[PDB]
Amino acid sequence: GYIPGLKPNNHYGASYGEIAKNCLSNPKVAQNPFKLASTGFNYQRHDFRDPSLTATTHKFGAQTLLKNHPSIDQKSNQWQSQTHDSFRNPLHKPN
């Protein structure tokens, strides 16, 4: 049932136990930036405003894309996977 991580955004290759661990333990998947209510009554307070528009016409008509994309973190696949020791020990388990 619905690992919030896998289907929505593609995850790079890894173990199913490890990949699942990373998602439900990270932030997000919670917290309301706008404070709308579950009942559906805080609706009239929020404005439902998307800040990804400027205008157009008479030159260019595409408009840039919404914040659902990466930046700054751009780094090849080789970087993430290959490193010597800057990762959690496979068998640490403090006791």
Binding site: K7, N10, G13, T57, G61, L65, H69, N77
Partner: protein, 430 residues
């Protein structure tokens, strides 16, 4: 290393590139003035293929804006990011081809093309190890059709071992822009095929259909059409400027898509491309990218892909994605349309991966496929041209500038012949 230079001509060529560099400029993070303002180490690792250095620290686009009239090249400078072009690169005449393929191919282009070739020589010589050229031009414009086509001919006489990529926009039957389109378009292909290492057909008709069915944007503008074509520009060289799991240069793509020496015409497409308002809802997950790749509407050319069978296709997947499901989807799309794929070339789908997405997306796919459909464009162009010739309509300008009536019929044999011979492999079986 393995750098490229850009030589573009015609008003269609000059404007189209202007959004081509602007799109390229942002990706590397080079601001209009020329001072680095990027964010990543990889951003500059391969700034040498398209950009050159000079004391002062700013970068130059290795292009030579060439056209036969002063308006176009004076205008492009004033545009945004319009300061990058080197003033010495500009070359232009003082008469104007007047949409006459004769003017830009025998009488006017010849006189001026002597110098423009010199700048081609200088830029080409400096590079470390030249790879090839990417030519932009529209076959419907006299000066563009003639001067652009005559420029390549001598170029093939000096660098026999370098690749030549040409982007042409052919006049579709639905919407036409010049009464003399069929004459100039028919002549051009006679020489482009024999000289160009690769030429990709682009149809204006498809774009306006694309802008509505997918974009749904109410008011498309000449910017909108340019944006889509520019995007596919980065696809062919997307992984050449970055590291990745599987490198793929222009030569490798050519080595795997041209079955026989006489077939070097392709058609392209871009994805994902979803309406502005409804962009937050879709899920960008591998299959959604591929299915949008093979749909008829997304195809950049007015020719219907499913009116013929694919001889081969190459998809340059780009971004972060596991290779296995990248490959598995390709296999699934090879049986489900088994008949639609020619059966004497087993396993006829090619794949590639690059790990640097542009600004605004997490995954995308650039499509370059060779399909039997393109016979529709040549026939339709062939049919109209054959109609105007029997009555000597509009012929009297070309004949007055050094040409003879015989020269056109020689073109007629070539255009149709390639039309028939293209379909010869469309029906052969084991």
């Amino acid at each position: 290393m393995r750098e490229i230079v850009h030589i573009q001509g015609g008003q269609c060529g000059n404007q189209i590139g202007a959004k081509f560099w602007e799109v390229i400029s942002d990706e590397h993070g080079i601001d209009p003035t020329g001072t680095y303002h990027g964010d990543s180490d990889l951003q500059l690792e391969r700034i040498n293929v398209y950009y050159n250095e000079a004391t002062g620290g700013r970068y130059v686009p290795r292009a030579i804006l060439m056209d036969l009239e002063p308006g176009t090249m004076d205008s492009v400078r004033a545009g945004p990011f319009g300061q990058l072009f080197r003033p010495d690169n500009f070359v232009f005449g003082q008469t104007g081809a007047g949409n006459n393929w004769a003017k830009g191919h025998y009488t006017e282009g010849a006189e001026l093309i002597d110098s423009v070739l010199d700048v081609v020589r200088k830029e080409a010589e400096g590079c470390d190890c030249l790879q090839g050229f990417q030519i932009t031009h529209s076959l419907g414009g006299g000066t563009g059709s003639g001067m652009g086509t005559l420029l390549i001919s001598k170029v093939r006489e000096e660098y026999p071992d370098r690749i030549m990529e040409t982007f042409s926009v052919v006049p579709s039957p639905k919407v036409s822009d010049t009464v003399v389109e069929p004459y100039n378009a028919t002549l051009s292909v006679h020489q482009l095929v024999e000289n160009a290492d690769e030429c990709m057909v682009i149809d204006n008709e498809a774009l306006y259909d694309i802008c509505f069915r997918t974009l749904k944007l109410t008011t498309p503008t000449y910017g909108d059409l340019n944006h889509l074509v520019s995007a596919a520009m980065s696809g062919v060289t997307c992984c050449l400027r970055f590291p990745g799991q599987l490198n793929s240069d222009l030569r490798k793509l050519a080595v795997n898509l041209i079955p026989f020496p006489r077939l070097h015409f392709f058609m392209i497409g871009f994805a994902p491309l979803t309406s502005r308002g409804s962009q937050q809802y879709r899920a960008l997950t591998v299959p959604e990218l591929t299915q949008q790749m093979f749909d008829a509407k997304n195809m950049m050319c007015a020719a219907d892909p499913r009116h013929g069978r694919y001889l081969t296709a190459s998809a340059l997947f780009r971004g972060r994605m596991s290779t296995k499901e990248v490959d598995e989807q390709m296999l699934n799309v090879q049986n489900k349309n088994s008949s639609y794929f020619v059966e004497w070339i087993p396993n006829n789908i090619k794949s590639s991966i690059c790990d640097i997405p542009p600004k605004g997306l997490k995954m995308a796919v650039t499509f370059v496929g060779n399909s039997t459909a393109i016979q529709e464009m040549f026939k339709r162009v062939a049919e109209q041209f054959t109609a105007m010739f029997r009555r000597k309509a509009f012929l009297h300008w070309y004949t007055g500038e050094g040409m003879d009536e015989m020269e056109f019929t020689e073109a007629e044999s070539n255009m149709n012949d390639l039309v028939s011979e293209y379909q010869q492999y469309q029906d052969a079986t084991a």
